[model samples]
Target: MTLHSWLDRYEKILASRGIKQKTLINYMSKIKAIRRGLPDAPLEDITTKEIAAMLNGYIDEGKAASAKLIRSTLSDAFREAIAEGHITTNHVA
Candidate 1:
């Protein structure tokens, strides 16, 4: 699936789990940043190590909190992806 599809699916998952509005907004912003960082990368190519790299890169830019939260969101996305058979684990976060 495309990143957009993963995003759409994950939002619904978040809603179902009672994720708060502010948290959702924060997650959206963080995901946008991640998307920008990996603009040309395919969804299937995004791995735990790649995510680690993104977070580390963000941390280097002084976005530690953002990096952590974005990693959390990535974990959430991975759960959904695993459930859908797109991936095999939540270790991506």
Candidate 2:
């Protein structure tokens, strides 16, 4: 799936699980930052190494804390993507 569609579905899934809308919006905000630095491609095309590199790039930019949050956000999203069959594995480790 495209990242946009994956994020949309992910947000809906989390919303359905009783997460508050404000919290979901907060989650998406940070997730959006991560997406900005990534290629616009199928979610399955992403690699753990590339994800790590992106996180490091954030660190390089003095966004260590943001990187941490982004990493967590991605891990969560990737897990859901795997469960939903959009990807086969969570590579945000």
Choose the strongest candidate by TM-score.
2
What are the runs in model 1 whose C-alpha is more than 4 Å off?
A: 39-43, 91-93
Q: Could you tell me how far off, in angstroms, the CA of residue 69 lies in candidate 2 after the best superposition?
A: 1.0
lDDT of 1 by residue, 1-93 (tens): 766567767777777877778877877787677677543444676766767777898789997788888887777777788898876756664
C-alpha lDDT of residue 2 in model 2 = 72
Error of 1 at 13 (Å): 2.1
- lDDT per residue for candidate 2 within 1-93, as digits (tens), equals 977678778777777888777877778788787668677679978777778888898899998778888888888988998888888877786
Model 1 lDDT vs. the true structure?
A: 0.72
Query: Candidate 1 has which clashing residue pairs, if any?
Result: none
For residue 17, give model 2's deviation from the true position in Å.
2.9
Indicate the worst ten consecutive residues by lDDT in candidate 1. 34-43
